[PDB]
RNA sequence: UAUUAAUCUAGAGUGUGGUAGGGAGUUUUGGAAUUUCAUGUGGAGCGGUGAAAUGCGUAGAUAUAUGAAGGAACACCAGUGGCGAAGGCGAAAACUUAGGCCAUUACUGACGCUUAGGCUUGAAAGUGUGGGGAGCAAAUAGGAUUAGAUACCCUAGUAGUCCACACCGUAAACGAUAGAUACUAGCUGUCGGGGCGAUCCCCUCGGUAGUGAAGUUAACACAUUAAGUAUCUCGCCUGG
């Protein structure tokens, strides 16, 4: 990806995007069954919803 | 008299009537409507003639081939229902018939038994004198 | 025997006498409680602020 | 039926050869008439296709039979002087129901809430009111008439009370 | 609130609605979910299909890295 | 296409009735004839097989109803091919 | 009740207008990426794991940027989501086609439910026939570990995962809940159709959620999307 800022203000958004990209990429490091992957999707959705409201 | 929502024939009038009256007795309603028939109106009349049903009005639709009946519940003082149980002995699959001498009694014969015999619809006590047998449909108490 | 001020969510069998009225609002409860206090005080011939008083008074919550 | 064809011309060649190619490949349709020819200018490519960076989009709308599309499709696919030959048909998500006309007011009414030229505006960008018309009946009533009533009775209203004697 | 349901689009052709289509793309060309815009489900699926075709039609980049 | 214009205008008793068994069986036979070609074109489609079986069973039910209800009604049906 | 003669549409069907859907077969194309190869750039590590080792690395590994070839899967989209009888269905388009929903003075006229037998479909694995085979890996080898390890750790790694024809009909093929049906307190959502009409909010009906009264229940729990009062039918069980 790409990110640009003058000298300093980049860091916070860089951390946010880097953590999001890492959490997305962790899904393609070791394979699981497709049904288990769907169940994991459901569980992540429930976790996010209950933490988001 | 408009309802804006029609009622249908369920599977057989006999079962549907008893299911609806039991639902009325258990869910605390005042007005309940059912399909109407000559046997139906006869049963309703013989039930209401001795203090088991209440004021019932039968309506005929504008096309003179359709008719249903609405009936109130038999209530008493201090908000207590009167229909204490209905049990359909007869069935669409099983049609159990008994002779005259073995006409069943409603737990002492003091309740109401419906005998739709060859001599029309008659209760147990009146039909005992006639010495005429018949069919048994439902115990009501 | 029991009397109570029941909102529109209760079971009208637990309490022998149901008087449905507002309870989330203060002055309504004030009025009904004062009427009941007059109803319990009339035994000892004590005076009343209601009960054949055509005029009412306001006491807002503070 | 209805059909739309969006075509990517080859490279960045001039408009004259572009129109020549457009009509030459347009005459490939078996027997369709009632067509239309339009152009959408020059646009750059956000991602390279084979080796080029710019192209022209051409949108052709027409209508005809469902058995007069194979020839042009295969001819465009075989030819190496085209890039994209995307086809759209009425099976695409759609709506033009004849009762959708009263949406005209809507197309203006939202613009009423979005209209703004001063900074002191205090109008409502979101006010759910749905002005009441009292016309909401969309169900068929079934009117009926009674016949008779046997042994009428009047039911007393619900009363729940006990303790008739305390003193 | 979203500017896709109240005003009413109800038909998304290939073009003549480019600004609205680009309104539903992030700087990295990712399609933002319902949790930001707020438009209807059917409208969201319609613009998703349109954006996928536009990707196939090179109106918007597949990925910007 | 599944276009339904032709067999309706000739298999009806009148233009006022479109619910008679005649139009029912004619349309069902036309649809069965369409699905035969459709399935022979798409050999390994199973929902098409299910639909064809359901429609032919429906046609059999209508034929047996007319057999045991109105003998003259299907006996004069020369457009409908038996077997 | 049953045979039967004759009527009506309130059951169900077909017609008309609107309407949703990753339903489904066949057929074309694209994108990241992985692998191999080609090009230039560079010098001792790379990889793996708790630590290590097998292995890979002067033949220039790794990495970098571009280019060529190849097979499989379609990032977000994507959801208290949708669609189906189920199995399951998610990049884009094309033709074929299945069913459903809302509203209807359309029309035959009880044609309906259910179904022993029979027939059709049915994840994955397996085999036969001919291809494909980029990774990924049953068995097997080696290294490491271990009291011993045929396993969890790692490097190769062929079946198969992919296609075309055919068979196999098996799984916790689950909602541990057969189908059709009338009625039986409410509330918070949520998608479609109709009216209303800036959606947002209102009303009518549906399928998809949670909560919850009576009642049901051994309890857990059930609750208009029954496991309730009930009917019809098929299948099933009488201690391991």
From Swiss-Prot, chain B:
GO terms for molecular function: rRNA binding; structural constituent of ribosome. GO terms for cellular component: ribonucleoprotein complex; ribosome. One of its GO terms (biological process) is translation. Pfam families: Ribosomal_S8. It comes from the Bacteria. Keywords: Ribonucleoprotein, Ribosomal protein, RNA-binding, rRNA-binding. InterPro entries: Ribosomal_uS8, Ribosomal_uS8_CS, Ribosomal_uS8_sf. The keyword Ribonucleoprotein applies. Part of the 30S ribosomal subunit. Contacts proteins S5 and S12. This is Small ribosomal subunit protein uS8. It comes from Mycoplasma pneumoniae (strain ATCC 29342 / M129 / Subtype 1) (Mycoplasmoides pneumoniae).
Curated annotation (Swiss-Prot), chain D:
The keyword S-adenosyl-L-methionine does not apply. Belongs to the bacterial ribosomal protein bS6 family. One of its GO terms (biological process) is translation. Residues 144-153 have a biased composition (Basic and acidic residues). One of its GO terms (molecular function) is structural constituent of ribosome. Binds together with bS18 to 16S ribosomal RNA. Keywords: Ribonucleoprotein, Ribosomal protein, RNA-binding, rRNA-binding. It comes from the Bacteria. GO terms for cellular component: ribonucleoprotein complex; ribosome. This is Small ribosomal subunit protein bS6. The keyword Acyltransferase does not apply. Signal peptide: none annotated. Residues 121-153 are annotated as: Disordered. It comes from Mycoplasma pneumoniae (strain ATCC 29342 / M129 / Subtype 1).
Curated annotation (Swiss-Prot), chain E:
One of its GO terms (molecular function) is small ribosomal subunit rRNA binding. Signal peptide: none annotated. One of its GO terms (cellular component) is cytosolic small ribosomal subunit. Coiled coil: none annotated. GO terms for biological process: translation. Keywords: Ribonucleoprotein, Ribosomal protein, RNA-binding, rRNA-binding. It comes from the Bacteria. Belongs to the bacterial ribosomal protein bS18 family. Part of the 30S ribosomal subunit. Forms a tight heterodimer with protein bS6. Binds as a heterodimer with protein bS6 to the central domain of the 16S rRNA, where it helps stabilize the platform of the 30S subunit. This is Small ribosomal subunit protein bS18. It comes from Mycoplasma pneumoniae (strain ATCC 29342 / M129 / Subtype 1). The gene is rpsR. The chain holds residues 40 to 104 of 104 of the full protein.
UniProtKB/Swiss-Prot annotation, chain F:
GO terms for biological process: translation. PROSITE patterns: RIBOSOMAL_S15. GO terms for molecular function: rRNA binding; structural constituent of ribosome. One of the primary rRNA binding proteins, it binds directly to 16S rRNA where it helps nucleate assembly of the platform of the 30S subunit by binding and bridging several RNA helices of the 16S rRNA. Forms an intersubunit bridge (bridge B4) with the 23S rRNA of the 50S subunit in the ribosome. GO terms for cellular component: cytosolic small ribosomal subunit. Part of the 30S ribosomal subunit. Forms a bridge to the 50S subunit in the 70S ribosome, contacting the 23S rRNA. It comes from the Bacteria. Belongs to the universal ribosomal protein uS15 family. Keywords: Ribonucleoprotein, Ribosomal protein, RNA-binding, rRNA-binding. This is Small ribosomal subunit protein uS15. The keyword Transmembrane does not apply. The gene is rpsO. Gene3D superfamilies: 6.10.250.3130, S15/NS1, RNA-binding (1.10.287.10). NCBIfam families: S15_bact (TIGR00952).
């Amino acid at each position: 990806e790409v990110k640009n800022d003058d000298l300093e203000l980049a860091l916070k958004k860089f951390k946010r995007v880097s953590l999001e990209i890492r959490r997305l990429a962790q899904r393609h490091e070791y394979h699981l069954r497709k049904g288990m992957r769907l169940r994991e999707k459901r569980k992540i959705a429930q976790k996010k919803r209950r933490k988001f409201r | 008299i408009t309802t804006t929502k029609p009622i249908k024939a369920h599977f057989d009038p006999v079962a549907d009537l008893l299911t609806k009256i039991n639902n009325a007795r258990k869910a605390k309603l005042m007005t309940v409507t059912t399909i109407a028939s000559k046997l139906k109106i006869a049963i309703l009349e013989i039930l209401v003639k001795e203090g088991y049903l209440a004021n019932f009005q039968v309506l005929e639709n504008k096309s003179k081939t359709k008719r249903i009946v609405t009936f109130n519940l038999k209530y008493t003082q201090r908000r207590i229902p009167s229909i204490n149980g209905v049990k359909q002995i007869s069935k669409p699959g099983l049609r159990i018939y008994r002779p005259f001498e073995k006409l069943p009694l409603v737990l002492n014969g003091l309740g109401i038994a419906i005998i739709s015999t060859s001599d029309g619809v008659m209760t147990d006590k009146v039909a005992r004198l006639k010495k005429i047998g018949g069919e048994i449909l439902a115990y009501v108490w | 025997p029991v009397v109570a001020l029941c909102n529109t969510n209760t079971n009208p069998e637990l309490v022998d006498f149901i008087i449905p009225a507002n309870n989330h609002q203060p002055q309504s409860t004030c009025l009904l409680m004062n009427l009941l206090a007059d109803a319990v005080a009339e035994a000892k011939a004590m005076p009343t602020m209601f009960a054949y008083k055509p005029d009412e008074e306001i006491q807002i919550e503070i | 039926m209805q059909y739309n064809i969006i075509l990517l011309v080859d490279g960045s060649l001039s408009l004259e050869q572009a129109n020549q190619v457009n009509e030459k490949q347009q005459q490939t349709l078996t027997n369709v008439e009632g067509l239309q020819t339009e152009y959408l200018g020059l646009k750059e490519l956000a991602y390279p296709i084979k080796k080029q960076l710019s192209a022209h989009y051409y949108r052709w709308k027409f209508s005809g039979d469902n058995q007069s599309t194979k020839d042009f499709k295969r001819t465009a696919n075989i030819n190496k002087q085209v890039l994209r030959e995307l086809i759209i048909n009425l099976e695409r998500e759609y709506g033009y129901l004849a009762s959708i006309n009263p949406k005209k007011q809507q197309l203006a009414l939202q613009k009423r809430a979005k209209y703004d030229e001063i900074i002191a505006r205090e109008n409502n960008p979101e006010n759910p009111d749905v002005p009441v018309t009292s016309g909401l009946a969309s169900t068929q009533p079934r009117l009926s008439r009674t016949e008779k009533a046997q042994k009428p009775k009047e039911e007393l209203w619900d009363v729940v009370q006990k303790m008739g004697n305390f003193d | 609130y979203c500017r896709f349901c109240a005003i009413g689009q109800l038909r998304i052709d290939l073009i003549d609605d480019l600004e609205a289509l680009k309104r539903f793309l992030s700087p990295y060309a990712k399609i933002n979910p319902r949790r930001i815009t707020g438009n209807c489900q059917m409208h969201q699926r319609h613009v998703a299909k349109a954006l996928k075709r536009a990707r196939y039609l090179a109106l918007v980049p597949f990925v910007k890295d | 296409q599944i276009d339904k214009n032709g067999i309706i205008k000739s298999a009806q008793l009148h233009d006022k009735d479109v619910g008679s068994i005649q139009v029912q069986v004619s349309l069902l036979t036309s649809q069965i004839k369409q699905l035969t070609d459709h399935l022979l074109a798409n050999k390994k489609d199973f929902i098409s097989k299910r639909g064809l079986y359901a429609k032919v069973s429906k046609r059999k039910r209508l034929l047996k109803y007319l057999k045991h209800n109105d003998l003259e009604a299907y006996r004069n049906l020369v457009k409908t091919l038996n077997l």
